[PDB]
Structure 1
């Protein structure tokens, strides 16, 4: 068991093993310090979870986050370098600590991207989404601020706890029945649009505005979609918002590679059953230069059955302790 040391930063008591030195606070992103990992001579990020077991929902949101992190073993998805408690036993266990690579910048703070810069960046998100989606995991919050970039334009999908609405699929904001993985693909269409145009595609001030801007471009729902909607009152409302003067795809992305617009019209589809999947989108001609189908791996089986459970503070806590302890650090 390693030797821990104690220091107070931004009125927070940090306790970490002696391998993490020179902790400086970075941020807005919660309780996060940049640290020098003495093991690997690489700068890392330490996150001290804020009162992880305060209630029942913190204790479950804490277990989930650690389960998710321990699962992600992909090039285009944030990985867990280390997790630790200073705690001796289960009895004295209150503080959880996560270690990740340091993210120099996000899609925003690295942004007139060339057609090839757009191809490469959207390829990597779809490659990261294929993997995530194969484990029946949905991001639900894909936006540029959740996409880390490096010196050499390589991208990781992650999820901080910080506008969402801009990248948010209509079915979520209209409260339709059928959610599916492809809520993320709409987001990738909204993010890619922005990289091509240099402007946010659906800059909504509120969710109703947001939907008026979406319907103006993607059209009013066609019959095949309307069939799947039960309530008269939802079917009316989606049409009450599709009154704004129609806009066409060929004029919004004029200048853009015709295969990028071809891909965007398959992403930005109202019908989430007809929307292209990460897996299908990787095989689109737009990525001809990068698509290797022997190098687009799926995820291992992910035990998601805990999501359904209603347990006590002590069970969620106990389960989380058993994850921290069973964590084998990845090989370099």
Structure 2
């Protein structure tokens, strides 16, 4: 069965979608794909509709498209965005170009929320718990989100949260400097920056320049020690520290005052500069600060996820074909 599409003009191009989606309004676009909000008549909820108009423009684009689509279809967790539908007007791989992705819109983005309210510790607690609970599930699939931002955390009027929009102030140092092999603790850094902002209401490292951003960080966590410099591989990186004035690592208890001491403890553990010593999600969920909500039995992981495609070198139409397969094979959620 093929659904009936209709055509209107938005943002300003021609959007052709199935009729289940009504009352489309543009919510803004960019270097990624245009997005309209719509009302889903099947589920009676308001949804986000994303139109990919340059998915197969090249190998880089095409593989990216297949990568994201595989991942979204695989993500099923209470605290992570899930793929509600995927469709194309194209009737055959021959005429295949545009891909639309639809997702559930929870009440608001957290960047927007933190303006409109000062958050209680009871809010931050439950908020940080769910990021970790979803992050644990993301990392269990051998995935790195790489782009944790308040703009990427949806929250609703009951303070329930979901991680969405997978991949410049919240990003771990070891990436900006191309030091090393960047592991999953890069997302824990962002969680640490996010937790700080939630408590204090102000951005923790509002860097303007790349250097400025780095400066602001070191004045808090201090400059690398003898142990970490051995672990920076390239000499460009290792010598970019030197004649830059050293700052000591600071005491966070004195930086965040009035904050819950257990919260202060957990931030010490997340914002360590050396990725090897930085805490994990599974270890974070067991932290005392979450004593109230932590349940080892309700913190699930992900079904094994086959990434073998990442090793393949294929032509566009090959990636194009594979993504079309995944679009045809999509199983919509229930309920």
- Smaller-chain TM-score bracket: over 0.9
Structure 2: segments with no counterpart, 5+ residues: none
Deviation of the 1:268 alpha carbon: 0.3
Q: TM-score, normalised by structure 1?
A: 0.94
What is the CA distance between 1:29 and its match in structure 2?
A: 7.3
Residue 232 of structure 1, CA deviation: 5.1
* Higher mean C-alpha deviation, range 144-153 or range 5-14: 5-14
Query: What does residue 49 of structure 1 align with?
Result: 52
Decide whether aligned partners of structure 1 residues 28 and 116 sit closer, same or farther in structure 2, where only a CA change above 3 A counts. farther
**For structure 1, which segment, 233-242 or 285-294, has the greater mean C-alpha deviation from structure 2 after superposition?**
233-242
Q: State the Cα deviation string for residues 300-327 of structure 1 (Å, max 9, x = none).
A: 1111222233321101110000000111
Q: Kindly state the Cα deviation for residue 227 of structure 1 after the two structures are TM-superposed.
A: 2.9
Residue 85 of structure 1 is matched in structure 2 by: 88
Moved more, 82-91 or 181-190: 82-91
Change (3 A) 1:261 1:85: same
C-alpha displacement of 1:236: 3.4
Distance 1:12 1:190, change over 3 A: same
More deviation, 151-160/112-121: 151-160
* Shift in alpha-carbon separation, 1:119–1:232, aligned structure 2, 3 A: same
Residues 198-249 of structure 1 deviation map (CA, whole Å, 9 limit, x = unaligned): 1111111112111221111112222332332344553332344452476431
Give the SS at the match of 1:166: coil
Deviation of the 1:64 alpha carbon: 1.2
Q: Describe the superposition over 1:93-141 as per-residue Cα deviations: whole angstroms up to 9, x where unpaired.
A: 1111111112432111111211110110000100111000011110111
Q: After superposition, what is the alpha-carbon deviation per residue over 1:25-77, rounded to whole angstroms, capped at 9, x for unaligned?
A: 22997411222222222222211112211222221121111111101100111
Residue 314, structure 1, aligned to residue 320, structure 2: no
1:187/1:6 CA distance change after superposition, 3 Å: same
Structure 1 unpaired stretches of 5+: none
Contact 1:4 1:17 survives alignment (8 Å) = yes
**Kept in 1: contact 2:147–2:166 (CA 8 A):** no
Q: 1:282–1:96: structure 2 CA closer, same or farther, 3 Å change rule?
A: same
Q: Identify if the C-alpha distance between structure 1 residues 244 and 273 changes in structure 2 by more than 3 Å, giving closer, same or farther.
A: closer
| Residues 22, 36 of structure 1: 8 Å contact kept | yes
> CA RMSD of the aligned region, Å?
1.8
CA contact 1:123–1:287 (8 Å) conserved in 2: yes
1:215/1:241 contact within 8 Å kept? no
State the number of aligned residues. 329
* Aligned residue number for residue 179 of structure 1: 182
Task: Decide whether the 8 Å contact of 1:212 with 1:241 is kept in 2.
Answer: no
232-241 or 127-136: bigger deviation: 232-241
Q: Is the 8 A contact 2:147 2:171 kept in 1?
A: yes
Deviations 1:127-185 (A, max 9, x none): 11100001111011111111111111111111278xxx311111111211221000000
Contact 1:132 1:138 in 2 (8 A): yes
Q: What does the per-residue CA deviation read over 1:278-298, in whole Å, with 9 as the maximum and x for residues that have no partner?
A: 110000000011111111110
Distance 2:110 2:200 in 1: 14
Q: 1:93-242 alignment to 2 at 5 Å?
A: 93-111=96-114, 112-159=118-165, 165-231=168-234, 233-241=236-244
